[PDB]
């Protein structure tokens, strides 16, 4: 099948990628980084995140595989020592594909821009004070004052969302989760405090109150947007697909990453 | 239709129930507290919780309606002043039914007991130290040391779960959420910390380590169980049905209860 | 000097105590468990806590030393392998004494009882719902609804207080810290949420609202008190004294117990 | 006495200041904004913060007074309606002065800069990832990865510190409190999590690991510092003095600001 391999770019990852390419040469596999059907990522979660965004226009035609060369890799299923067995199983095919939900961010100006997030999308102020009205399905829910907000996919819940006190959600749940960053709460200013978990087709809109300039992050990418009228969050209709060759359940992955391994 | 009305039992609620019965007498409505199709609860959430558990064997044949006579009532949709309009709309029928998920708790001994929860089920120790192994879909996830654990339905997430730092989840999500109560974490003892959100068909089992006696709560009911071998949590296949006569969205209900009203 | 040794009571601790007694026999040291000047505790923090409460009437005439035989021991300064060096240094004397603050709990009825805590004192309800008015220096501060409250000494801040989200406080600060256990907060019920840190001479009183029966803990001891009119917390004028033979700073002790060792 | 009055600069505050100046003209009071002995601040806490920093070189010779013209004012003791009584009492003198502790921040380069904070000093990264080693009294305590750190005075504990989960500390306690902003914790990265409370003479140093550029805030002032070798926190020897004309206790001030008023 058509395939490509991204590398973190250190010596370990580059040589691992070269050896897999050499191994792939022994099968009906064509290296193609324009229209791959299989995208392998060799490095950390940052590397896997960059592989996702490199091919976010072809998510429907691609299955992803992560190899972690450090001690981490939540999106990784394979250690560097299993790489030969990965080549062989991937060549013979017959893998099972699993899909995780993604988050759609729409940014409107006074012009529209959409982004897709695998981990989360966050909003902070452009230096000044961050104040936004939070509107859920056209209902004014709260006026948020504080550092920012974080909207997470299910597989993102173990990332920034976790550090903000959010819940960890199994990725079979088509949802997104909103967490607060250092909200101000006194007798005049009130936010819900708790993380909020939204189903598909629910729309969370953030609307400016004074300043209209915000720093918006999508996974690792952070951009300053000016003249923002609205930031709109919904569960995407698009999904990321992983090639799975063995059982590595989400809650064991959580256990291995946070409890012990 | 067949109907019945439970009351909190103070003067306000008893007289409101009597006036609705008098009002219902002017329609083809039969008061029947054995096999009602409509169960009205006049009081607080405690009163609504008791109405649910009074009829938990007929959940499939019943639509519930809550009237709050205090300043509260998350499961209430109606103030006492709208009661006449409620009688009339309920008599004419043509309401829409909505369903919220429920939580199944199974308790095994060395003998089995199942319970249904609308808010949550919690586990604490019988005086001694609480230590349980947490097993998710037969995978040992963690050994929990601390005060206890709380497993919440979606509509329970605004109740005890919220006070434990859990996320608020829209009830259209068929899930349950596990929160920690004062976990011990040092270099030898480790829990995940974060709330965990589980989909349908996922099974969370709690298994004793030393003591086998636990205080188990199901909504307001708290029972000491002895010789416990396992406590098993899953999303129930049963659902509670509410009669809805107008739009009162979950997130507005959350806003009204916690932000402002 | 006069000394005594308490043991956890397993084989390791009993034989360690016997060997130290044998070692102490080679110096001008008299074993006396009625009026010791040195109290050695061999076991865990539970064992050290029991040694403190065994001699809480002679705190001014006693220096404590902890030996941890497990992997833990926040109040321990010594591993079992250093016990011979401990005997020798303790015999030669010339140690430095350090003092940590303690917490005074006063419980009034309709009759008065005082208790001294090294870790903390907690209050919960006797089965029913816990509601108390919190009065600081005779000023009504809040009405607490929830599971309970925890008042911690500085050295207790790394114990139950920590699991409740409290701050870790250096023991040179003569203070006590109040933390909430699962407080109810909605638009009608409001608590401060945050831990509160009180100086010496500040008095925190808890006063019942409906039920007057409470479960009160003092370190490991938990007693049900009936007909309670008031629970009064203040920093004690009494202090626990530790014999110190080398520098083991509080923040390194915290690092070793929670970060890495 | 020598006095001056800062104003927020809206119509309400400017006219209030003019009326107090007119009122002060009827007493032996000289308006002097170079060497005042009394500094009155008319506005919000932001206004009071700016008054403190305008005169931070003469803290020993100045007593501060806050008048809040909005609904807030933690450092304010007076509403605009009491301003005439304030002029009269301040003219007759015989007020009592109270002192709150302050925080010293030292920033070293490869050159030294010191700052004084009334609320807090915070550190974040200059766009990249924030990683610092936390050294307490020359002991390496932890390597912090996350959004940033916040070091708070006692009177700052109700401000940013509170929103970060920190404890509220009575200002008679000469301490500073360190809180985490969204720390990363997994099986490879570990921070203490809990807020840390440090006494006088304890030194907290933050030392870079990779990037040496940081955004450092001191109260409202936020500056990007380059080539930073160390950020050093200690309780200052300097104190802010407030003129007090009546009892308004700290815990009532907390109650009024966060519970009800
Ligand atoms: N954008 C600022 C860069 C600083 N963040 C950072 O050092 N994160 C890397 C660590 O997180 C792990 N990770 C990832 C990741 C990654 C790569 N990362 C770096 C890059 O791409 O350059 C971007 C992400 O970073 C996270 N992040 C940012 N700030 C914080 C914070 N304060 N606390 C916690 N996470 C934070 C956000 O969610 C970004 O999306 N996804 C997951 C996951 N699904 N589950 C469990 N672990 C996961 C990864 O293995 C490693 O252990
Ligand atoms: N079992 C000990 C009794 C003490 N609990 C108590 O006074 N709760 C009543 C308050 O909570 C509101 N509520 C209910 C409720 C109710 C009735 N309640 C009393 C009864 O039945 O006697 C039993 C429930 O109590 C909750 N609970 C227990 N302990 C705590 C705690 N520490 N913190 C927060 N909640 C707690 C548990 O989830 C029980 O199921 N469901 C929801 C909901 N879905 N959404 C939002 N508000 C809700 C209700 O309007 C009122 O404002
Ligand atoms: N009363 C229920 C018994 C269950 N508690 C329990 O297993 N605690 C033992 C663990 O905590 C460590 N510890 C102690 C201790 C001890 C002995 N303990 C047992 C006994 O005496 O039987 C009584 C204390 O327990 C604590 N506790 C109770 N419940 C919780 C909870 N949910 N979360 C966290 N702590 C809790 C309270 O503060 C009691 O005072 N002091 C400190 C300290 N100063 N600093 C750091 N670690 C410390 C000790 O090394 C061991 O690792
Ligand atoms: N630097 C970014 C500006 C955004 N911050 C903001 O709107 N804060 C104002 C609100 O906080 C109250 N306040 C102050 C204050 C003030 C003036 N403020 C604005 C200015 O000077 O322009 C600077 C301070 O802001 C705080 N801050 C910043 N970010 C957050 C956050 N995410 N969450 C909570 N607080 C935050 C920090 O501690 C700064 O020092 N001191 C106290 C206190 N001692 N006790 C209780 N309330 C207090 C004040 O009445 C008002 O209700």
Whole-angstrom CA distances from A140 to A203, A228, B135, B167, C60 are: 12, 18, 40, 19, 62
* Rounded distance from Cα A136 to ligand 4 centre (Å): 27
- DSSP string spanning D16-47? HHHHHHHHHTTSS-EE-SSS-SEEEEEE-HHH
- Smallest Cα–Cα separation from B227: which of B213, B247, B207? B213
CA-to-CA distance for A118 and A66, rounded, in angstroms?
14
Please check whether residue A212 is in contact with residue A228, taking contact to mean a CB–CB distance below 8 angstroms.
yes
CA-to-CA distance for A61 and A238, rounded, in angstroms?
11
Q: From the CB of residue C11, how many other CB atoms can be counted at a distance below 10 Å? A: 8
Q: Identify the experimental approach.
A: X-ray
Nearest to D261 among A183, A187, A256 (CB): A187
- Smallest Cα–Cα separation from A163: which of D214, B160, B158, B193? B193
Mutate to test the interface with C, among D188, D194, D201 (most CBs of C within 10 A): D194
Q: Which residue has the tokens 């992560």?
A: A66
Dmax over CA atoms of chain D, in Å, equals: 69
| A11-24 vs A83-92: helix crossing angle, rounded to 10 | 30
Measure in Å the smallest separation between the Cα of A67 and chain D Cα atoms.
18
- Whose C-alpha lies nearest to ligand 3, atom 47? C159
- Whose C-alpha lies nearest to ligand 3, atom 7? B129
Q: From the CB of residue D188, how many other CB atoms can be counted at a distance below 10 Å? A: 12
DSSP code, position D178: E
CA-to-CA distance for A14 and A11, rounded, in angstroms?
5
DSSP code, position D165: T
Question: Cα dihedral angle (B54, B59, B62, B63), rounded to 10 degrees?
Answer: 100
Q: Which residue of C has its CA nearest to D167?
A: C195
Q: Are strands C2-7 and C30-31 parallel, antiparallel or unpaired?
A: parallel
Whole-angstrom Cα Rg for chain D: 20
| Structure-block tokens of residue B71 | 């300043």
| C11-24 vs C83-92: helix crossing angle, rounded to 10 | 30
Resolution in A, one decimal? 2.0
Contacts of B142 in chain A (CB under 8 A): 255, 259
CA-to-CA distance for D76 and D65, rounded, in angstroms?
7
Handedness of CA C43, C48, C53, C59 (dihedral sign): positive
Q: Coil, strand or helix: which one is B252?
A: helix
- Identify the burial level of A203 via C-beta atoms within 10 angstroms of its C-beta, where 0-12 means exposed, 13-18 middle and 19 or more buried: middle
In the sheet that B168-169 helps form, which strands lie side by side, from edge to edge? A221-225, A214-218, A120-125, A148-152, A175-181, A196-199, B168-169
Cβ-defined contact of C187 to B127 (cutoff 8 Å): no
Q: Which residue has the tokens 């609308």?
A: B118
| D83-92 vs D11-24: helix crossing angle, rounded to 10 | 30
- Identify the burial level of A121 via C-beta atoms within 10 angstroms of its C-beta, where 0-12 means exposed, 13-18 middle and 19 or more buried: buried
Spatial neighbors of B94 by CB under 8 A, at least 6 apart, are none
| B83-92 vs B11-24: helix crossing angle, rounded to 10 | 30
C180 lines ligand 2 (CB under 6 A): no
| Structure-block tokens of residue C207 | 């006063």
Residue from C120, C159, C177, C253 whose mutation best tests the ligand 3 pocket (most atoms within 8 A of CB): C159
Residue D188 CA: nearest ligand 1 atom is 52
- DSSP string spanning chain A? -EEEEEE-SSHHHHHHHHHHHHHHTTSS-EE-SSS-SEEEEEE-HHHHHHHHHHTGGGGGG-EEEEEESSS--SS--B-GGGHHHHHHHHHH---EEEEEEEEEEEEEE--EEEEEESSEEEEEESSS-EEEEEEETTEEEEEEEESEEEEE-TGGGGTHHHHTTPPEE-TTS-EEEEEEES---SSS-----S-EEEETT--EEEEESS---EEEEETTEEEEE-SEEEEEEEEEEEEEEEEESS---HHHHHHHHHT--
- Smallest Cα–Cα separation from A192: which of C144, B250, B172? B250
Cα angle vertex B229, ends B227, B231, to 5°? 110
Please check whether residue D129 is in contact with residue D144, taking contact to mean a CB–CB distance below 8 angstroms.
no
Please check whether residue A76 is in contact with residue A46, taking contact to mean a CB–CB distance below 8 angstroms.
no
CA-to-CA distance for A199 and B173, rounded, in angstroms?
7
* Rounded distance from Cα A146 to ligand 1 centre (Å): 21
Cβ-defined contact of D197 to C169 (cutoff 8 Å): yes
- Conformational region of residue C17, where left means phi above 0, alpha means psi within -120 to 50, and beta covers everything else: alpha
Contacts of B133 in chain A (CB under 8 A): none
Q: Coil, strand or helix: which one is D188?
A: coil
Please check whether residue D147 is in contact with residue D130, taking contact to mean a CB–CB distance below 8 angstroms.
yes
Please check whether residue D241 is in contact with residue D97, taking contact to mean a CB–CB distance below 8 angstroms.
yes
- Smallest Cα–Cα separation from B207: which of B227, B229, B191, B192? B229
| Structure-block tokens of residue D116 | 């004084």
| Structure-block tokens of residue A233 | 């969050």
Task: Give me the catalytic one of A14, A45, A133, A211.
Answer: A45
* Rounded distance from Cα B46 to ligand 2 centre (Å): 7
Q: Coil, strand or helix: which one is B57?
A: helix
| Structure-block tokens of residue B47 | 């009163």
Spatial neighbors of D107 by CB under 8 A, at least 6 apart, are D113, D114, D115, D216, D225, D228, D230, D231, D232
Report phi then psi at C15, rounded to 5.
-70, -30
- Smallest Cα–Cα separation from A42: which of A67, A61, A18, A64? A67
CA-to-CA distance for A144 and C134, rounded, in angstroms?
30
Q: Which residue has the tokens 């170079």?
A: D34
Q: Which residue has the tokens 């071998």?
A: B229
Beta bridge partners of B205: B135, B232
* Rounded distance from Cα D159 to ligand 4 centre (Å): 6
Cα angle vertex B129, ends B126, B133, to 5°? 100
Report phi then psi at C119, rounded to 5.
-95, -65
Mutate to test the interface with B, among C182, C220, C223 (most CBs of B within 10 A): C182
Spatial neighbors of A117 by CB under 8 A, at least 6 apart, are A102, A103, A105, A151, A153, A156, A218, A219
Q: Which residues of C are catalytic?
A: 45
SS3 content of chain D, % helix, strand, coil (to 5): 25, 45, 35
Ligand 4 residue neighbourhood (C-beta within 6 Å): A 129, 146-147, 182, 184, 186; D 44-46, 49, 72, 74, 119-120, 155-156, 158-160, 163, 219-220
B15 lines ligand 3 (CB under 6 A): no
In the sheet that D148-152 helps form, which strands lie side by side, from edge to edge? C168-169, D196-199, D175-181, D148-152, D120-125, D214-218, D221-225
Q: Are strands A120-125 and A221-225 parallel, antiparallel or unpaired?
A: unpaired
- Whose C-alpha lies nearest to ligand 2, atom 23? B220
- Smallest Cα–Cα separation from A118: which of A76, A167, A169, A152? A152
Spatial neighbors of C139 by CB under 8 A, at least 6 apart, are D249, D251, D252, D255
Q: Which residues of B78-96 are buried (b: 16+ CB within 10 A; e: fewer)?
A: bebeebeebbeebeeeebe
> Counting one residue from A and one from D, how many pairs have CB atoms under 8 Å apart?
45
């Amino acid at each position: 099948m058509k395939y490509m391999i991204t590398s973190k770019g250190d010596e370990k990852s580059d040589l691992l990628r070269l050896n897999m390419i050499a191994g792939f040469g022994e099968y009906d596999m064509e290296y193609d980084d324009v229209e791959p059907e299989i995208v392998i990522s060799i490095g950390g979660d940052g590397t896997f995140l960059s592989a996702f965004h490199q091919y976010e226009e072809r998510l429907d035609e691609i299955a992803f595989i992560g190899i972690h060369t450090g001690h981490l890799g939540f999106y990784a299923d394979w250690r560097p020592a299993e790489a030969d067995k990965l080549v062989k199983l991937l060549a013979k095919g017959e893998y099972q594909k699993v899909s995780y939900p993604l988050l759609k961010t729409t940014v409107k100006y006074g012009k529209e821009a959409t982004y897709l997030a695998l981990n989360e999308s966050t909003v902070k102020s452009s230096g000044g004070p961050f104040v936004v009205d939070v509107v859920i399905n056209d209902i004014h829910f709260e006026r948020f004052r504080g550092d920012g907000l974080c909207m997470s996919t299910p597989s993102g819940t173990t990332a920034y969302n976790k550090s903000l006190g959010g819940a960890l959600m199994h990725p079979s749940i088509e949802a997104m989760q909103l967490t607060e960053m250092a909200s101000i709460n006194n007798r005049v200013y009130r936010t819900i405090g708790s993380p909020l978990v939204f189903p598909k087709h629910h729309v969370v809109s953030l609307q400016p109150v004074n300043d209209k300039d915000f720093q918006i992050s999508v996974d690792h990418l952070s951009i300053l947007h000016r003249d923002v009228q609205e930031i709109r969050y919904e569960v995407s209709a698009k999904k990321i697909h992983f090639a799975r060759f063995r059982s590595f359940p989400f809650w064991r992955r959580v256990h291995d990453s946070f409890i012990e391994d």
